[PDB]
Design a protein around this ligand. Structure first.
Ligand SMILES: [Mg+2]
Ligand SMILES: [Zn+2]
Ligand SMILES: [Zn+2]
Lengths: 1338, 70, 99, 397, 100
DNA sequence: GCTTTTTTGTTTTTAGTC
DNA sequence: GACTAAAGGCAAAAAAGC
């Protein structure tokens, strides 16, 4: 019925227009009868009748005068619903001021007047006077006054002395002054000002008043003079026993204020003296204050047994408030709850239902079905007919069940697949029979977990359930890239047993006509399930445009593989099922099908997989017994050796040769080595147990042991569980973190000592407690992701931008973790893709790289293709379809309208359960050596040594692909060069883990420009055997001596301060503190020779939590945000100053630099724009503000991806990036033109204002803003829509702020639309609104 | 009967205005309804619309154009 | 446990709770997120407006089901208008500016 | 050593003293400002505040829990419960990770296995079988004194702190015939850690292999083979078992079944030895032995067995006479069997014949198959008793 | 000992001293079976013997009258059953030990 | 189990000082 | 001129009354 909400203050005339009458007396009911007073508060003439289509006197009896007024009772004879909506008003003889603007911490009245609130309160409750040009020359309009001053001025001037009182005086002062000259004068004041403390207050005031003048609300309207009255339905008064009533709190205060009004009216009916006028006006003032907001100032309840009453504020906010507890979390009917079980005979779109639950849920539909057929007559007849559960009821229910999907959802709906749809199938029992495969999506085992069933009612709901909700459509997980219908625990082992091959069995070595024959050979018990037959098969290929060409051959395989191949669809190659089909393969299997044949073949193929796997797992038989878990015989012997060496280490401590720590490390290391040896021995024994002869000699092959079948097939378990079952359980650690020195030497099959079990107890208690307490903190995190990314709705198709830099595969020091193939898959390119062949373009720009363009990248060895990102989009409160990328839930590209922020929040929150709470460079591959940030010089040995600390090295493949990356620290020698073809296993750089500092030019070292003894100390130690030179700091050395920043004077044979020739600066290098120099005096030093030697990750869930919050770390790594040559500052009482000397521009910059921590910055460092100064963690704030917006994107996504990969969880990078586009939602104005000077506000609003301004005001500078970030916790508080802000935090403040500022809400979010009850404009609701505006209000 | 919308996705791919026009079709097939264009096998109107997507002459863009026809 | 339509609480027009007294299954808000993450808007509208906290729509919907219809009321529920009246009561001018 | 157990006596004393001082200040004031010689103590003293305070403490508190009657094991492990909650402990929100952990001094005093799961884990751990309280309130455990190399049969009780500066051997360590260890380097534990010590160094030996686990976890057979988490799961679901109409003996047990059955008061035990004279489905008459019954009173024993009665978990209690006519009984002998027991031995469920094999997915992940034969013979059917109460009040009408 | 903690009772200036002498436990009014049947606490009455001694006013500590109130009723004390549990109204409730 | 009261962790403003 | 430390206020939580 609308598409936007505007909120503003109200005018007295329009307030009266809202009203329908004037209330005179508070008598809500008369005695001896039950007729509300015709002229009282509960007035029919003002609100309406209490009877449907009848007047108070009842002369018009619901047949002749519907809707027209009555002569006796002046109320229109109509229904009672008008009484629910009709409202009146109360006229105030003495105008009063609204109290919220007085009681708000940012007092709007105080801000607009530039006086505090203490005096305003005094003059409002009649304790001090207000001057209104009492004297033309003595004082001004904005001064307070007292009684004695008023009398003194009255005798002084008298004729010109005027000074009113109270709220009427306040509103007279407010109206009598303008705001224009104020706005220009404040703009000029901020234009020429120096202070900063009052600068923010002045900017806030000028913004508030310039919004006020634009809002269209007159300030005097804030001082209300007519108060509307709530309709009587909101204040019910039910008649209790004996003429009593519910005692509604609203009616009590209404009676109080109306009594005050009547008493004031009577007081002014005879021109009472001002002595008692003030008292009555004040009493009415606290009366209206209590009604408008009770208990805020005086707590004047006076209407209860010493408990507060709910006047207005209690019913705005609070948990008892209805907003976020009655439209966010609530009861619902048409639902049931029950336990689950496994129905392994159903299809993907079918779920069972008990008969009792089915009839209970669908009884309203039964009556409609029954009455249509005419079997029943009335609703009671139908109810009593179905009550007996007769024959026709079952068949009609089975008829209505056929097409009516029901929604199933577990209680913890963590992610998008929590709620699914199904077609019911009526069965006997009292449990929800569920498909097995879909239970992987719910993460719901069958140990008693309960699920709830809902039911849609309207055609819209059922049709959308069929289109979207049903499981057959939601095949692919929205998280990263993979289906949720991967075959589950039991079926995988069945398929694994389907496809094996022994060396000799009944019926092997012969040939079969086709897969049909193999079924008959096995079923009749003439050949084994797995053999070495040669069968002829015919398949199809999709080489042509939709035409399946057939080919046949004789492919050697096993019997079981043909049985499996029977059920695969048409167009798949046979190479997929030759190998021993494990678990990861089958999933990949489905993936392949999803990318060749579509959806229906894939789902029917998965169903066939489940059926065949279950059938041939049941028919196979796979039991576990003691004889199946074989203990390696060597294991016992092993411990002896370990024991022996352990004793040896003890002797080392017995003679004092070793200390406690190193002995402990040695014993734990040797025990770990023994554990590794025994684990390898047990794996070797298990893997090749089977030795079956084939025509004479014995042959070895893969073992058929049940435990190894479970481990290898991936159905359940892993190497760790199998190692624990037979081998060592492994040495456990004490809960504080210390590892015990005596590992458990016995497995579960063998006996366990009481101490070993007791030691192993608290190892599992810690994990159990962590899992138990993790269900709260992790899930709560999802909330803090949903509110910030609540809307993020895709609105239009394409914006046309082409930004974004360097979307490349990430290398993490060692080998690459994920290639470019999966990183860019699903995204759409922006720049043209250039094949590495000198402008031989392969992939055109603006194309979706799904598989085919990805298939064109591996052969060209492309490693740097940039695609359009979410952050690099310039729309209005949305994202372009051609910028977000391909939707992950469905094969095609993203649709129009569907929400992305909630998808991302749920996808990032789901892996929380699997998320825990608490010197040289070595090459490994073959390729060419390449160095980034090339800054190196030839050393004394002829090799290369770098002088730039930020140098990095990467190994490059012969095709140009980067395969390795290594950070090269300062003072590292190079063992190779750029472009040299070097294979693996050869170090190329070496550095000390002290950091050496090295010169750049050859010659002597004339040790001058330093004070001997003071700066350099002759530390003639016995170890070094020479009088070393140690440059102590200011605190270590004498304060007077350390006052020149000593620098060694490297000289040539001439003995002079030789310079870098004509270019930069002499050989004087400022030695920092503790510059350990082994040279004594005047020793020849070649170029690139050392000068001195400086003696220099929390849990995953906290890491994610404080990364999204953008919390500053313990030590933010300071960075040089300016170019030029860096210098050294002065010394103060604390952290030493450090001045920078840029070669151009505003060079005089310095900062507060700590000295105790390491500072790898020197005088001879030609720093650049955006290079780090210190070392350690870096907050996102500086990264965003200095090195571009894209820099912060590449940082946090890499950090969270590293965390998740460490936790063994992979998610797509679209979800992490989009919230970033929402995280960077603010900016700060640098150059004026749009804001005042520094109004930190929405960056999109400023950008859209500037873009349209430049079209019309060509030449204006506008606003050269800086896009600054904000933590999600802070970002949720700065929502553009005021409804979302008012949802949970400080409802009174935000409502007043929106009212005074005239805020207009366009309803762009989702939570805000849920709050008001309108359809959410994210899913099908978005298409409704777009079609609603097209036809109507076009 | 019909359970999937792969045919709708592969050529008329959109999940929102498609269900909107299907609802508009089904609402006036239920009340004030007339005979459908395809045979019925104990189905309601909550599934007959999707099958009409398969025949081709009824599609998401067709209904929007067909709105002018009505 | 299963419930179609029974009694309602006196203070708020919500179905009862627990297995006893013919209670109704609780509908939180994490599944509100999970359901708005889909394209689902009509189901959300139904199950937050007419199924749970309505009185005029609730009785009408029951009567609109038995007579062979499944048609809702395509308009703003009165649970929103009352809120509007609330904001209109204090001092505030709130209105559906665009229609 | 820094944690002390308060039993019912200490809280009873504290509440009694609180009510005492509360009434005593008032009566002292009244006596001071009232009569002097012509007054009786009875009228000036008061009893209602003390009675109200003690009854409120007994019947309403976060530590006076509700007894569970669904199983004898449930009630024994509930009476053997130690809780860190209540008025004087710590809350769930402010409970740290370190107070939810197993300290190395719990060996023999508090069970490290039996512990409720969820929000409150490590706070409601029960105490072991041999653990007994000290006179000061500390927890004390038995040990066997070893003088030089021989174990003395006499027991010796040790507190927590006193254990710190000692060396204690292990029960599984073998003794040849009189305590001589098979190996002169025997395993041991001295200060929160395990190591290997010489034969002459040890002086104390643990009494048995059972004082580590509680009663709730000492009836799981082959406990030394399964995981600790699964041990806890088994202990909990063994606690929560429901009795059948006809309990059957466990084929594999532990030997503590008789102790748990007879120490608990559910079953009827012969108080004095003798011979049986008349059996009935509701009462038992025992002809007490002549030489045992004291002179003066020459009667015979009567045991009035209880029948179907409502329990806190709505399960049924009914004693069954497991004796016949004319057979001798001894002192402390079992005469009747209550719910979930038979012949004085605990019996919680039934011994089924099971096979481990996947079967058409009907046992897909954790689900189970049941043959229709067992539901024919009603081997698992239970009986439940429900209470319906209707009150007749008086309104105004 | 609980009585002995507040054993002396002494007036302001009236020279009145109230002291404990002895107590005895009364028999339970109803046995456990009818307590479960009827819904009453299986408790015991508390009887105490209190001695009030008075001295001459404004005179040294010389006794005048010894009022010995025997079997003073001080409410009901719930009793533990022989199985080691308490019953409050109709349902047995056991108080577990507390670790502090 | 529903609802109000008092208590403690998180947030915000202002006087004093390097 | 900016950093440090103090209280008021705001919101979430345990407890008690109905
Ligand atoms: Mg289950
Ligand atoms: Zn009339
Ligand atoms: Zn775009």
């Amino acid at each position: 019925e609308f598409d936007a909400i505007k909120i503003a203050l109200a005018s007295p005339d329009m307030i009266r227009s809202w009203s329908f009458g004037e209330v005179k007396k508070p008598e809500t009911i008369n005695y001896r009868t039950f007729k509300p007073e015709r002229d009282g508060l509960f007035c029919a003439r003002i609100f309406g009748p209490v009877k449907d289509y009848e007047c108070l006197c009842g002369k018009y009896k619901r047949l002749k005068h519907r809707g027209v007024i009555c002569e006796k009772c002046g109320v229109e004879v109509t229904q009672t619903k008008v009484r629910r909506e009709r409202m009146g008003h109360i006229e105030l003889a003495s105008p009063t001021a609204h109290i919220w603007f007085l009681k708000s911490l940012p007092s709007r009245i105080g801000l607009l007047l530039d006086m505090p609130l203490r005096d305003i309160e005094r003059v409002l409750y009649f304790e001090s006077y207000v001057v209104i040009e009492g004297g033309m020359t003595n004082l001004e309009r904005q001064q307070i006054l007292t009684e004695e001053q008023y009398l003194d001025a009255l005798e002084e001037f008298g004729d010109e002395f005027d000074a009113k009182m109270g709220a009427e005086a306040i509103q007279a002062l407010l109206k009598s002054m303008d705001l224009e000259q104020e706005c220009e004068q404040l703009r000029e004041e901020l234009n020429e000002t120096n202070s900063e403390t009052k600068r923010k207050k002045l900017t806030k005031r000028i913004k508030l008043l310039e919004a006020f003048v634009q809002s269209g609300n007159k300030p005097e309207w804030m001082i209300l003079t007519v108060l509307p009255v709530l309709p009587p339905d909101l204040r019910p008064l039910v008649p209790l026993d004996g003429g009593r009533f519910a005692t509604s709190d609203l009616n009590d205060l209404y009676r109080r204020v109306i009594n005050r009004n009547n008493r004031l009216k009577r007081l002014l009916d005879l021109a009472a003296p001002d002595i008692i006028v003030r008292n009555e006006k004040r009493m009415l003032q606290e009366a209206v204050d209590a009604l408008l907001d009770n208990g805020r100032r005086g707590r004047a309840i006076t209407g209860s047994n010493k408990r507060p009453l709910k006047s207005l504020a209690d019913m705005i906010k609070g948990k008892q408030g209805r907003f976020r507890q009655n439209l966010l979390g609530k009861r619902v009917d048409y639902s049931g709850r029950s336990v689950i079980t496994v129905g392994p005979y159903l299809r993907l779109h079918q779920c069972g239902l008990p008969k009792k639950m089915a009839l209970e849920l669908f009884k309203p539909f039964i009556y409609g079905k029954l009455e249509l057929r005419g079997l029943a007559t009335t609703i009671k007849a139908a109810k009593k007919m179905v009550e007996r559960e007769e024959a026709v009821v079952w068949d009609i229910l089975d008829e209505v069940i056929r097409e009516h999907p029901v929604l199933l959802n577990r209680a913890p709906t963590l992610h998008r697949l929590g709620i699914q749809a199904f077609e019911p199938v009526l069965i006997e029992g009292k449990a929800i029979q569920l498909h097995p495969l879909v239970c992987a999506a719910y993460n719901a085992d069958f140990d008693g977990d309960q699920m709830a069933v809902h039911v849609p009612l309207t055609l819209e709901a059922q049709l959308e359930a069929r289109a979207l909700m049903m499981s057959t459509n939601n095949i692919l997980s929205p998280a990263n890239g993979e289906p949720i219908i991967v075959p589950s625990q039991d079926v995988v082992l069945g398929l694994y047993y389907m496809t094996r091959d022994c060396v000799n069995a009944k019926g092997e070595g012969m040939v079969l006509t086709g897969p049909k024959e193999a079924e008959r050979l096995y079923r009749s018990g003439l050949a084994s399930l797995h053999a070495r037959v040669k069968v002829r098969i015919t398949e199809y290929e999709k080489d042509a445009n939709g035409e399946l060409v057939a080919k046949t051959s004789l492919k050697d395989t096993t019997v079981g593989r043909a049985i499996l191949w029977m059920i695969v669809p048409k167009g798949l190659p046979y190479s997929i099922v030759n190998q021993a089909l494990g678990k990861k393969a089958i999933s990949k299997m489905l993936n392949t099908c999803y990318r060749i044949l579509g959806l229906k073949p894939t789902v029917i193929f998965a169903d066939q997989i489940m059926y065949t796997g279950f059938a041939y797992a049941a028919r196979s038989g796979a039991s576990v017994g003691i004889d199946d878990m074989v203990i390696p015989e060597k294991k016992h012997e092993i411990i002896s050796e370990a024991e022996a060496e352990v004793a040896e280490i003890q002797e080392q401590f017995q003679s004092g040769l070793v200390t406690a720590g190193e002995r402990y490390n040695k014993v734990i290391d040797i025990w770990a080595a023994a554990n590794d040896r025994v684990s390898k021995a047990m794996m070797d024994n298990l893997q090749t147990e089977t030795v079956i002869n084939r025509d004479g000699q014995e042959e070895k092959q893969v073992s058929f042991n049940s435990i190894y079948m479970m481990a290898d097939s991936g159905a359940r378990g892993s190497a760790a569980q199998i190692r624990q079952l037979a081998g060592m359980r492994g040495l456990m650690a004490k809960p504080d973190g210390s590892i015990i020195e005596t590992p458990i030497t016995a497995n579960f099959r063998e006996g366990l000592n009481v101490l070993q079990y007791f030691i192993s107890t608290h190892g599992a208690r810690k994990g159990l407690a962590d899992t138990a307490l993790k269900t709260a903190n992790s899930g709560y995190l999802t909330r803090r992701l949903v509110d910030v990314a609540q809307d993020l709705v895709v609105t239009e198709d394409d914006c046309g931008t082409h930004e974004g830099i360097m979307m490349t595969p990430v290398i993490e020091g060692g080998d690459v973790k994920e290639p470019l193939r999966d990183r860019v898959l699903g995204r759409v390119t922006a720049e043209d893709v250039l094949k590495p062949g000198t402008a031989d373009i392969l992939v055109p720009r603006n194309t979706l790289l799904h598989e085919q363009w990805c298939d064109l990248l591996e052969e060209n060895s492309v490693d740097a293709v940039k695609v359009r990102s979410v952050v690099s989009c310039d729309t209005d409160f949305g994202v372009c379809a051609h910028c977000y990328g391909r939707d992950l839930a469905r094969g095609h590209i993203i649709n129009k309208g569907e929400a992305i922020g909630v998808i991302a929040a749920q996808s990032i929150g789901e892996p929380g359960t699997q998320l825990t709470m608490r010197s040289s460079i070595q090459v490994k591959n073959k390729g060419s050596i390449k160095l980034s940030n090339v800054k190196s010089v030839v050393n004394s040995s002829g090799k290369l040594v770098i002088t730039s600390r930020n140098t990095e090295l990467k190994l490059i493949d012969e095709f140009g692909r980067t395969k390795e990356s290594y950070k090269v620290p300062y003072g590292a020698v190079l063992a190779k060069g750029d472009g040299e073809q070097v294979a693996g296993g050869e170090t190329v750089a070496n550095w000390d883990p002290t950091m050496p500092v090295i010169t750049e030019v050859s010659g002597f070292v004339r040790f001058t420009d330093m004070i001997d003894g003071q700066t350099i100390t002759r530390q003639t130690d016995e170890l070094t055997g020479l009088s070393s030179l140690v440059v102590l700091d200011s605190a270590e050395r004498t304060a007077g001596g350390k006052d020149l920043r000593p620098a060694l004077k490297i000289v040539d044979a001439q003995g002079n301060d030789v310079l870098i020739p004509g270019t930069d600066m002499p050989a004087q290098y400022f030695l920092p503190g503790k510059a350990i120099v082994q040279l004594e005096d005047g020793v020849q030093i070649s170029s690139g020779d050392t000068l001195a030697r400086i003696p220099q990750i929390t849990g995953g869930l906290p890491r994610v939590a404080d990364l999204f919050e953008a919390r500053r770390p313990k030590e933010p790594a300071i960075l040089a945000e300016i170019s030029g040559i860096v210098s050294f500052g002065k010394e103060t009482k604390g952290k030493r100053r450090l001045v920078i000397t840029p070669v151009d521009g505003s060079d005089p910059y310095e900062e507060m630099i700590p000295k105790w921590r390491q500072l790898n910055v020197f005088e001879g460092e030609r720093v650049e724009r955006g290079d780090v100064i210190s070392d350690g963690p870096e907050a996102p704030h500086d990264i965003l503000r200095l090195r571009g917006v894209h820099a912060v994107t590449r940082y946090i996504v890499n950090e969270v991806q590293d965390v998740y990969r460490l936790q063994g969880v992979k998610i797509n990078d679209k979800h992490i990036e989009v919230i970033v586009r929402q995280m960077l939602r603010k900016a700060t104005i640098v150059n004026a033109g749009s804001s005042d000077f520094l109004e930190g506000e929405q960056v999109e609003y400023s950008r859209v204002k500037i873009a349209n301004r430049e079209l019309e005001a060509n030449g204006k500078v506008g606003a050269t803003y800086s896009r600054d970030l904000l933590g999600i916790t802070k970002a949720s508080l700065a929502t553009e829509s005021f409804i979302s802000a008012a949802s949970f935090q400080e409802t009174t403040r935000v409502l007043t702020e929106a009212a005074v500022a005239g805020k207009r809400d366009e309803l762009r979010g989702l939570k805000e639309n849920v709050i008001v009850g309108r359809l959410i404009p994210a899913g099908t609701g978005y298409a409704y609104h777009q079609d609603r505006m097209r036809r109507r209000a076009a | 009967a019909r359970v999937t919308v792969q045919d709708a996705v592969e050529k008329i791919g959109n999940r929102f205005d498609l269900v909107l026009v299907a609802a508009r079709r089904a609402r006036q097939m239920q009340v004030g309804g007339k005979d459908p264009l395809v045979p019925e096998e104990n189905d309601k109107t909550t599934v007959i619309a999707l099958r009409e997507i398969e025949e081709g002459l009824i599609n998401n863009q067709i209904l929007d154009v067909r709105e002018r026809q009505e | 446990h299963a419930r179609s339509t029974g009694s309602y609480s006196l203070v708020t027009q919500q179905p009862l709770g627990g297995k006893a007294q013919f209670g109704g299954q609780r509908f939180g808000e994490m599944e509100v997120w999970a359901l708005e993450a889909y394209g689902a808007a009509y189901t959300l509208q139904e199950m937050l407006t007419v199924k749970s906290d309505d009185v005029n729509g609730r009785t009408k919907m029951y009567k609109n089901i038995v007579d062979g219809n499944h048609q809702m009321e395509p308009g703003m529920p009165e649970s929103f208008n009352v809120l509007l009246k609330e904001i209109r009561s204090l001092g505030i001018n709130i209105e559906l500016e665009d229609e | 050593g820094n944690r002390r157990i308060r039993s019912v006596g200490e809280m009873a004393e504290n509440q009694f003293r609180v009510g005492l001082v509360r009434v005593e200040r008032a009566v002292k004031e009244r006596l001071s400002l009232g009569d002097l010689d012509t007054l009786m103590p009875q009228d000036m003293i008061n009893a209602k505040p003390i009675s109200a305070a003690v009854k409120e403490f007994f019947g309403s508190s976060q530590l006076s829990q509700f007894m569970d009657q669904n199983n004898p094991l449930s009630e024994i492990t509930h009476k053997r419960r130690i809780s860190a909650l209540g008025p004087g402990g710590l809350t769930r929100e402010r409970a740290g990770f370190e107070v939810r952990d197993v300290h190395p001094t719990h060996y023999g005093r508090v069970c490290p296995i039996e512990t409720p799961e969820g929000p409150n884990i490590g706070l409601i751990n029960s105490l072991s079988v041999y653990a007994q309280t000290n006179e000061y309130g500390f927890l004390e455990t038995p040990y066997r004194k070893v003088t030089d190399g021989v174990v003395t049969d006499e027991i010796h009780y040790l507190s927590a702190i006193e254990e710190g500066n000692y060396v204690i051997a292990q029960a599984n360590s073998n003794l040849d015939e009189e305590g001589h260890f098979v190996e002169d380097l025997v395993t041991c534990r001295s200060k929160g850690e395990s190591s290997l010590f010489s034969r002459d160094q040890v002086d104390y030996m643990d009494v048995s292999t059972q004082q580590v686990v509680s009663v709730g976890a000492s009836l799981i057979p082959f406990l030394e083979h399964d995981d600790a988490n699964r041990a806890l799961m088994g202990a909990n679901m063994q606690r929560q078992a429901v009795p059948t109409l006809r309990a059957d003996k466990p084929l594999v047990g532990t030997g503590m079944e008789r102790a748990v059955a007879v120490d608990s008061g559910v079953t009827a035990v012969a108080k004095r030895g003798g011979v049986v004279q008349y059996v009935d489905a509701s009462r038992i008459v025992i002809k007490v032995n002549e030489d045992e019954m004291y002179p003066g009173e020459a009667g015979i024993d009567i045991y009035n067995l209880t029948k179907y009665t409502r329990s806190n978990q709505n399960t049924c209690i009914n004693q069954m006479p497991c004796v016949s006519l004319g057979e001798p009984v001894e002192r402390g002998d079992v005469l009747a069997d209550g719910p979930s027991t038979d012949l004085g031995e605990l019996a919680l469920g039934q011994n089924m014949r099971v096979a481990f094999m996947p079967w058409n997915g009907y046992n897909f992940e954790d689900s189970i198959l049941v043959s229709e034969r067992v539901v024919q013979e009603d081997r698992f059917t239970t009986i439940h008793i429900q209470e319906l109460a209707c009150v007749s009040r008086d309104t105004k009408l | 000992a609980a009585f002995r903690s507040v054993f002396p009772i002494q007036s302001y200036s009236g020279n009145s001293e109230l002291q404990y002498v002895s107590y005895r436990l009364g028999e339970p009014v109803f046995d456990v079976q009818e307590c479960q049947i009827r819904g009453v606490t299986y408790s015991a009455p508390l009887r105490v013997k209190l001695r009030l001694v008075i001295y001459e006013r404004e005179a040294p500590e010389g006794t005048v009258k010894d009022i010995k109130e025997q079997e003073v009723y001080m409410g009901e004390i719930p009793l533990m059953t022989d199985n080691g549990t308490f019953v409050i109204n109709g349902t047995e409730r056991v108080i577990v030990s507390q670790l502090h």
